[PDB]
Design a protein around this ligand. Structure first.
Ligand SMILES: Cc1cc2nc3c(=O)[nH]c(=O)nc-3n(C[C@H](O)[C@H](O)[C@H](O)COP(=O)(O)OP(=O)(O)OC[C@H]3O[C@@H](n4cnc5c(N)ncnc54)[C@H](O)[C@@H]3O)c2cc1C
Ligand SMILES: CCCCCCCCO[C@@H]1O[C@H](CO)[C@@H](O)[C@H](O)[C@H]1O
Ligand SMILES: CCCCCCCCO[C@@H]1O[C@H](CO)[C@@H](O)[C@H](O)[C@H]1O
Ligand SMILES: CCCCCCCCO[C@@H]1O[C@H](CO)[C@@H](O)[C@H](O)[C@H]1O
Ligand SMILES: CCCCCCCCO[C@@H]1O[C@H](CO)[C@@H](O)[C@H](O)[C@H]1O
Length: 499
């Protein structure tokens, strides 16, 4: 009998499970495929506040999101850091005066302790923008490695004594005799599981209503508005460290975000989507849309041929019945119901990456009446697994290379920005490059891949190359198939057992 079972291992499920485990609940988190396999790896990777939501009057959300930025930067310094954003002025769309106030709200809605001011810009004949654009504005927000933020939370669950199972799909949940009985199946081996729990969380993202309908045969409190958004990736469009936020002719904004020193991400789009969330992928008109708003602003033109990767996901969004996808609220709603005072179901509707910690604390607040002697709120003071450094650059990578002098500058940078304070567990007793074992390409060594399987739930090559890391951007097809082969070998046995 678990205290709490959480179904879903995106950001919301992992954040709720972690918060619960740290309040002394016995927790089990179930993830059908891999941690952050769906929406929580398909985001624009921003911890924001949501500048564009001010136009819609979403103060509560914007204020919350803005003040969380500083909390999240402290919790996960290895994977989250400040970024500057440049907004080119387009007075036919929004007048300078409106922007020159919008910016002060964004500055004093949360109360920031550390993120720099906000400034005007002028653009000259030599800038990266087309000459007709002569003015803009620059303000602070944060970038975060979305999929590794979910991983850090799953690690926290385990640290606090909780249990995490991936490749394990919950197939039903029903209330019997005052308890939940939850059934689940291993997606590979068909192994069936059944647990009892005192309380159940439905944090299944795009599937949240479907799990009501198919898993539980209970009425969903809300409908869900699956709104697809896609991103494109190109070799970095300029050498500047700032992101740009572009005002499009439809009133939407599109970002151009530096990524991994080598690339730029451009996105995103707002497309009503119907069908299987697993099948989501970018469409031609999204490519045309994103290249347009980029090419209208920047001198250096991009074509379809420059794109080197794309990705796509579906925002679950609580259905507030808005006619326009870009206007549907991005704020979350939690619903909780019990039967005869027992066996609460808490279901998550919406919930940006940015607000996950607050969402989780709110969830546990709602769950509290059901758990005698449950611990208090705690995560605001916590440091997630990997976060116990002190400046990423900065000097953690410098500090690493000082301890482990066989590390290249590039590899030390990768470990600091990926594993953070867990780098020493990865590197174990290594004292040369050869101690890292097989080189799979782009300084992705056996020591790393083994660590990922042992400590980061990696089961398949995509887990390691696209969620745990983004080494998939560099490894060729042959190298990616060798990673898959190594995993089959390592995970099939000699460590998976018969002891
Ligand atoms: C295009 C795009 C860009 C975005 N950009 C940002 C941004 O810049 N900043 C920000 O803060 N937010 C952003 N978001 C929003 C954010 O990504 C999502 O709100 C967040 O990822 C929601 O995650 P979730 O945990 O609720 O859903 P998920 O955890 O992603 O989905 C449910 C997960 O649980 C598992 N699961 C589902 N059903 C079952 C079941 N039956 N049994 C067992 N397991 C199951 C799945 O495999 C799935 O991965 C963006 C969203 C989109 C779509
Ligand atoms: C009647 C409502 C008018 C006031 C609108 C609130 C101003 C904030 O509005 C925001 O301003 C930003 C720049 O600061 C823009 O980039 C965003 O797209 C816009 O949503
Ligand atoms: C002159 C327009 C060139 C486009 C580059 C941005 C400079 C716009 O500068 C001006 O901003 C003011 C308030 O919005 C107003 O004087 C005008 O609407 C606008 O032209
Ligand atoms: C610093 C913001 C003060 C708050 C009041 C906003 C008034 C808008 O200040 C802006 O100044 C520009 C000249 O620099 C003009 O081009 C714009 O027309 C004007 O609206
Ligand atoms: C006295 C200080 C002014 C505060 C700004 C109040 C916000 C509403 O301001 C109004 O918004 C309209 C719709 O966007 C605009 O068309 C109007 O020009 C503007 O005056």
């Amino acid at each position: 009998t678990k205290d709490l079972i959480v179904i879903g291992g995106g950001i919301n499920g992992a954040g709720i499970a972690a918060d619960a485990a740290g309040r002394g609940l016995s927790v089990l988190m179930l993830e059908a495929q891999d941690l952050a396999c769906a929406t929580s790896s398909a985001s624009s990777k921003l911890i924001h506040g949501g500048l564009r939501y001010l136009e819609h009057y979403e103060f509560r959300l914007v204020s919350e999101a803005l003040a969380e930025r500083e909390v999240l930067l402290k919790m996960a310094p290895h994977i989250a850091f400040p970024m500057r954003f440049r907004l080119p002025h387009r007075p036919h769309l929004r007048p300078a005066w409106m922007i020159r106030i919008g910016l002060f709200m964004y500055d004093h809605l949360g109360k920031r302790t550390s993120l720099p001011g906000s400034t005007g810009l002028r653009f000259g004949a030599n800038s990266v923008l087309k000459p007709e654009i002569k003015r803009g504005f620059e303000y602070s927000d944060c970038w975060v490695d979305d999929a590794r933020l979910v991983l850090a939370n799953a690690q926290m669950v385990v640290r606090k004594g909780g249990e995490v199972l991936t490749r394990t799909r919950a197939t039903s949940a029903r209330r019997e005799n005052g308890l939940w009985i939850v059934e689940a199946e291993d997606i590979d081996t068909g192994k069936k599981y059944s647990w009892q729990a005192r309380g159940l969380v439905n944090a299944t993202g795009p599937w949240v209503k479907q799990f009501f309908d198919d898993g539980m045969h209970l009425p969903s409190p809300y409908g869900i508005r699956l709104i697809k958004g896609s991103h494109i990736v190109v070799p970095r469009v300029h050498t500047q460290k700032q992101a740009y936020i572009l005002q499009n002719e439809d009133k939407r904004i599109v970002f151009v975000i530096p990524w991994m020193d080598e690339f730029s991400i451009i996105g995103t789009t707002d497309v009503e989507y119907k069908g299987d969330p697993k099948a989501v992928k970018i469409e031609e008109s999204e490519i045309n849309y994103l290249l347009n708003v980029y090419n209208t602003h920047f001198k250096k033109q991009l074509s379809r041929d420059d794109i080197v990767w794309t990705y796509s996901g579906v925002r679950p969004l609580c259905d507030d019945e808005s006619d326009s996808p870009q206007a549907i609220t991005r704020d979350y709603t939690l619903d909780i119901h019990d039967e005869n005072g027992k066996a609460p179901l808490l279901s998550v509707f919406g919930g940006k990456l940015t607000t996950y910690r607050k969402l989780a604390e709110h969830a546990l607040e709602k769950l509290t009446p059901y758990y005698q002697g449950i611990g208090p709120a705690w995560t605001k003071e916590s440091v997630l697994p990997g976060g116990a450094i002190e400046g990423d650059r900065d000097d953690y990578a410098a500090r690493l290379r000082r301890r482990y002098p066989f590390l290249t500058e590039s590899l030390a940078r990768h470990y600091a920005r990926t594993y953070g304070s867990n780098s020493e567990l990865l590197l174990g007793n290594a004292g040369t490059v050869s101690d890292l074992g097989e080189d799979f390409g782009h300084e992705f060594y056996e020591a790393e891949l083994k660590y990922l399987v042992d400590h980061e739930w990696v089961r398949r090559a995509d887990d390691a190359l696209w969620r745990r890391t983004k080494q998939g951007m560099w490894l060729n097809a042959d190298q990616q198939s060798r990673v898959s082969q190594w995993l089959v070998e390592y995970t099939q046995q000699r460590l998976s057992l018969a002891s």
